[PDB]
Structures are given as structure tokens and as C-alpha cells.
Write an enzyme that holds these catalytic residues in place. Structure first.
Site, PDB file in Angstrom:
ATOM      1  N   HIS A 133     -37.873 -17.435  22.098  1.00 60.27           N
ATOM      2  CA  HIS A 133     -37.684 -17.416  23.555  1.00 60.27           C
ATOM      3  C   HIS A 133     -36.885 -18.643  23.974  1.00 60.27           C
ATOM      4  O   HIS A 133     -36.578 -19.494  23.145  1.00 60.27           O
ATOM      5  CB  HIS A 133     -39.029 -17.402  24.275  1.00 60.27           C
ATOM      6  CG  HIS A 133     -39.829 -18.633  24.031  1.00 60.27           C
ATOM      7  ND1 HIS A 133     -40.808 -18.697  23.069  1.00 60.27           N
ATOM      8  CD2 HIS A 133     -39.731 -19.876  24.556  1.00 60.27           C
ATOM      9  CE1 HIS A 133     -41.321 -19.916  23.050  1.00 60.27           C
ATOM     10  NE2 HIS A 133     -40.688 -20.648  23.948  1.00 60.27           N
ATOM     11  N   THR A 188     -45.849 -25.549  25.038  1.00 58.36           N
ATOM     12  CA  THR A 188     -45.388 -26.087  26.315  1.00 58.36           C
ATOM     13  C   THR A 188     -45.712 -25.205  27.529  1.00 58.36           C
ATOM     14  O   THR A 188     -45.196 -25.470  28.616  1.00 58.36           O
ATOM     15  CB  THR A 188     -43.877 -26.478  26.306  1.00 58.36           C
ATOM     16  OG1 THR A 188     -43.069 -25.303  26.182  1.00 58.36           O
ATOM     17  CG2 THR A 188     -43.558 -27.461  25.140  1.00 58.36           C
ATOM     18  N   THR A 189     -46.525 -24.161  27.329  1.00 54.79           N
ATOM     19  CA  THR A 189     -47.090 -23.364  28.442  1.00 54.79           C
ATOM     20  C   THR A 189     -48.604 -23.231  28.230  1.00 54.79           C
ATOM     21  O   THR A 189     -49.071 -23.338  27.101  1.00 54.79           O
ATOM     22  CB  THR A 189     -46.413 -21.954  28.609  1.00 54.79           C
ATOM     23  OG1 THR A 189     -46.601 -21.167  27.431  1.00 54.79           O
ATOM     24  CG2 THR A 189     -44.934 -22.079  28.873  1.00 54.79           C
ATOM     25  N   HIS A 195     -42.021 -15.466  32.346  1.00 57.43           N
ATOM     26  CA  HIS A 195     -41.688 -16.907  32.303  1.00 57.43           C
ATOM     27  C   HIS A 195     -40.547 -17.274  31.341  1.00 57.43           C
ATOM     28  O   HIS A 195     -40.163 -18.443  31.243  1.00 57.43           O
ATOM     29  CB  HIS A 195     -42.928 -17.774  32.017  1.00 57.43           C
ATOM     30  CG  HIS A 195     -43.788 -17.271  30.898  1.00 57.43           C
ATOM     31  ND1 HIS A 195     -43.665 -17.727  29.602  1.00 57.43           N
ATOM     32  CD2 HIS A 195     -44.774 -16.337  30.877  1.00 57.43           C
ATOM     33  CE1 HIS A 195     -44.547 -17.107  28.833  1.00 57.43           C
ATOM     34  NE2 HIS A 195     -45.227 -16.253  29.580  1.00 57.43           N
ATOM     35  N   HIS A 222     -36.621 -21.837  21.391  1.00 60.37           N
ATOM     36  CA  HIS A 222     -37.804 -22.060  20.568  1.00 60.37           C
ATOM     37  C   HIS A 222     -38.044 -20.851  19.669  1.00 60.37           C
ATOM     38  O   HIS A 222     -38.196 -19.727  20.169  1.00 60.37           O
ATOM     39  CB  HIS A 222     -39.029 -22.302  21.462  1.00 60.37           C
ATOM     40  CG  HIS A 222     -38.987 -23.602  22.206  1.00 60.37           C
ATOM     41  ND1 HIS A 222     -39.672 -23.810  23.386  1.00 60.37           N
ATOM     42  CD2 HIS A 222     -38.351 -24.765  21.930  1.00 60.37           C
ATOM     43  CE1 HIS A 222     -39.457 -25.045  23.804  1.00 60.37           C
ATOM     44  NE2 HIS A 222     -38.664 -25.645  22.938  1.00 60.37           N
TER      45      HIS A 222
HETATM   46  C1  MZM Z   1     -48.623 -17.691  22.155  1.00 61.59           C
HETATM   47  C2  MZM Z   1     -47.308 -18.417  22.186  1.00 61.59           C
HETATM   48  O1  MZM Z   1     -46.552 -18.441  21.224  1.00 61.59           O
HETATM   49  N1  MZM Z   1     -47.028 -19.013  23.343  1.00 61.59           N
HETATM   50  C3  MZM Z   1     -46.271 -20.137  23.450  1.00 61.59           C
HETATM   51  S1  MZM Z   1     -44.798 -20.400  22.553  1.00 61.59           S
HETATM   52  C4  MZM Z   1     -44.768 -21.923  23.429  1.00 61.59           C
HETATM   53  S2  MZM Z   1     -43.569 -23.048  23.231  1.00 61.59           S
HETATM   54  N2  MZM Z   1     -42.746 -23.084  24.624  1.00 61.59           N
HETATM   55  O2  MZM Z   1     -42.726 -22.667  22.132  1.00 61.59           O
HETATM   56  O3  MZM Z   1     -44.132 -24.326  22.956  1.00 61.59           O
HETATM   57  N3  MZM Z   1     -45.763 -22.190  24.312  1.00 61.59           N
HETATM   58  N4  MZM Z   1     -46.643 -21.100  24.286  1.00 61.59           N
HETATM   59  C5  MZM Z   1     -47.802 -21.219  25.192  1.00 61.59           C
HETATM   60 ZN    ZN Z   2     -40.849 -22.600  24.509  1.00 55.27          ZN
END
Ligand code: MZM
Ligand code: ZN
Length: 259
Positions: free
Chosen positions: A97, A200-201, A70, A122
């Protein structure tokens, strides 16, 4: 849950069924979610939001970067940390990411004054707790990416690595680079927005203290396009990785502040 979570684009681009964002489970349906639109003139200045201190951000490293199905994610394995930023503790860096599209006016998760950017980066950190879980267990630093004609040399090690990880669960090693290589000039990071929200996931846990920096990263249009050109959501390579963006959530009764 009747199928795996996906972004809208994945459901639209494939006949294999999946759960789109408005249908996500976990905590994704609760009332303190992210991302949001930030009305910049309505965010109140909070003088206690001072400068960030970055540790390990200037050191040249050979990072592991991987396609997780993703996004593309650099593993920071506690080799960097942050303090200051009006944060209540130091936070250890876990991963970096990105979210993107293939058009300049979209790709970011957050928007500023109703403007989306070409990407959003992020950097995810975890709180150093004490004795005395919390709403601020995770600190995510969000950087907006603006498309232009300026080649960002700092991003090149990352952009070149993308060719090596087209399919999910593939990993590679980036050429020597620092986290600062990926960021705007440090002095320009004094202006940021701050609010409390969610990941956000899925499972979208409401344990994030958000920082969205005002200063965008400048990346060449073709450096941004390399992400959708080189990456895929699936091992079958049927859906190019792009529009990995959660739709906007309502602020509700929350407050956004700025430095
Ligand atoms: C375990 C982890 O860091 N996952 C993440 S990082 C993220 S985010 N997109 O930075 O808000 N969303 N999720 C679900
Ligand atoms: Zn993110």
C-alpha cells in the site's frame, strides 16, 4: 474510543468527528513507534546487513488492488517473499500500500535527513517462525517516491486501476505487472536503513522490523497526483485521499543501522 481513527486531513476536511493521530488509541501511544526521521550520517554501518533476495517479485501477475478507506492496497497473498536483508527468517508478502500527498516535498511517512518525499510505499511481510508475537513479526519494506518528469512505465498498471476504485471497499484487477515494475532497479537496493518500530495505523503494534531503502522510486508528478485525483476516503466522495500520513515519532533510545 469515542470515534473511528482518522488522519488530520480527514478531521480538517469534514464536520463528521473522528480521532486524529495524536489522539489514536491501541498501542499508538507507546514508546517504540514509527515513522521516524533518519539522520543518515548517524546510522552505523552493520556489515551483517547484506543484500535482499526477492521471490515472486519478477513474475507478471494480475493483482487485486483495493481502496480500504485509508490507502490503496494490492493483495499479495503470499505470492512473493523475501530473505536476506539481515533478516532472521524468510518473510511472506501479504500486501502493498502507499502513503502520499499532492505536493512534492511531503507525502512520505519517514524522512531522511529531514526531507520528506512525495510518497512512501510499504510492502508488508510476515515472519516464518519456528518453535523455541515477536518484535520482528512483520517486515515492512519502505520505498520513498521522488516526483519528477520521468514517466514510470512500471507504475502505469497501478495508476490506471485507481480510476476504478474511487470509494472505500471497492476492488479491481490490475493489468499484467510484477512487483519489480514498482521498485527501483534491484542493484540500487543494497543501501538501506534498518530499525525496530510499529505499524503506522491503529493499533500501531510494536512488531515491525523496518527497512527504508536509500534509493527513491522516480514517478512523474502527474502519476503521483493521480492518487489524490482518483481516490476518496469516503463513499460520499467529500474528502480526496491524500495526506494519509502519520506524523513523525521520537526515536527515543532505539538505534538505527544501515547496510
Ligand atoms: C494489518 C496491517 O498490515 N496493517 C498495517 S500495514 C501498516 S504500515 N503503514 O505498513 O506500517 N500499518 N498497519 C496498521
Ligand atoms: Zn503503510
Amino acid at each position: 474510543a469515542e470515534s473511528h481513527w482518522c488522519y488530520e486531513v480527514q478531521a480538517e476536511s469534514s464536520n463528521y468527528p473522528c480521532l486524529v493521530p495524536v489522539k489514536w488509541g491501541g498501542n499508538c501511544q507507546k514508546d517504540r513507534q514509527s515513522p521516524i526521521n533518519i539522520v543518515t550520517t548517524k546510522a552505523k554501518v552493520d556489515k551483517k546487513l547484506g543484500r535482499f533476495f526477492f521471490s515472486g517479485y519478477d513474475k507478471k501477475q494480475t493483482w487485486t488492488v483495493q481502496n480500504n478507506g485509508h490507502s490503496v492496497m494490492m493483495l499479495l497473498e503470499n505470492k512473493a517473499s523475501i530473505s536476506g536483508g539481515g533478516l532472521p527468517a524468510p518473510y511472506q508478502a501479504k500486501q502493498l500500500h502507499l502513503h502520499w500527498s499532492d505536493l512534492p516535498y511531503k507525502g512520505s511517512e519517514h524522512s531522511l535527513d529531514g526531507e520528506h518525499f512525495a510518497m512512501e510505499m510499504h510492502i508488508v511481510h510476515e515472519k516464518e517462525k519456528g518453535t523455541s508475537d515477536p518484535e520482528d513479526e512483520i517486515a515492512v519494506l519502505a520505498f520513498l517516491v521522488e516526483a519528477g518528469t520521468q514517466v514510470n512505465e512500471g507504475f502505469q498498471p497501478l495508476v490506471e486501476a485507481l480510476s476504478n476504485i474511487p470509494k472505500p471497499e471497492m476492488s479491481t484487477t490490475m493489468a499484467e505487472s510484477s512487483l519489480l515494475d514498482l521498485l527501483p532497479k534491484e542493484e540500487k537496493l543494497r543501501h538501506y536503513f534498518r530499525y525496530l518500530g510499529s505499524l503506522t495505523t491503529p493499533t500501531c503494534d510494536e512488531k515491525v522490523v523496518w527497512t527504508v531503502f536509500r534509493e527513491p522510486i522516480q514517478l512523474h508528478r502527474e502519476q503521483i497526483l493521480a492518487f489524490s485525483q482518483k481516490l476518496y476516503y469516503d463513499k460520499e466522495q467529500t474528502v480526496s485521499m491524500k495526506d494519509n500520513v502519520r506524523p513523525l515519532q521520537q526515536l527515543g533510545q532505539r538505534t538505527v543501522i544501515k547496510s
